[PDB]
Amino acid sequence: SMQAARLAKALRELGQTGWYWGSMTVNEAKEKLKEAPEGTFLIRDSSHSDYLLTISVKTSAGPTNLRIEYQDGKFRLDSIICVKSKLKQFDSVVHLIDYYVQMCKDKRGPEAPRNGTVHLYLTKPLYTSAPSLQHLCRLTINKCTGAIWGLPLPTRLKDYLEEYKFQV
């Protein structure tokens, strides 16, 4: 597969999430995430010219925005200082978010820091529209097991589950 086909599949998976808001200003993202719990996130279009996607996250000190870099067929988070081997990069932007949500399942309530440089935290998304009942069942199945090819399902539906293996 070539680069344009990988990017097209990554954008299709973005549209299947239900937490991709398209055109959305910074203030509109701040309003929707003002009272949301810490870790609530959403992906919207980037008002910047050199970017395409932006994450709006509710952190310890309020809502902020993280631009998603797309370089050499892989999606990365905007970083102030990086070592290339130490920064996660994937062909799918939903895989990038699913990667950090899984990592942040073991994040520290009382043990968390209370003042200093804010720590990143991603948990549950903020849906802009209700996804299809099929996709909701796919997420529940994915959060239950990763070996879908042993389930009592027709092969047609097993291909549907393989098209979206993420838990978020």
């Binding site: 701040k30 000190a61 309020g62 902020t64 993280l66 988070l77 970083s79 990143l120």
Partner: peptide
């Protein structure tokens, strides 16, 4: 409060 736009720093 947090700035409107930030970048990550792994620590």
């Amino acid at each position: 409060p947090v700035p409107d736009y930030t970048s990550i720093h792994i620590x």
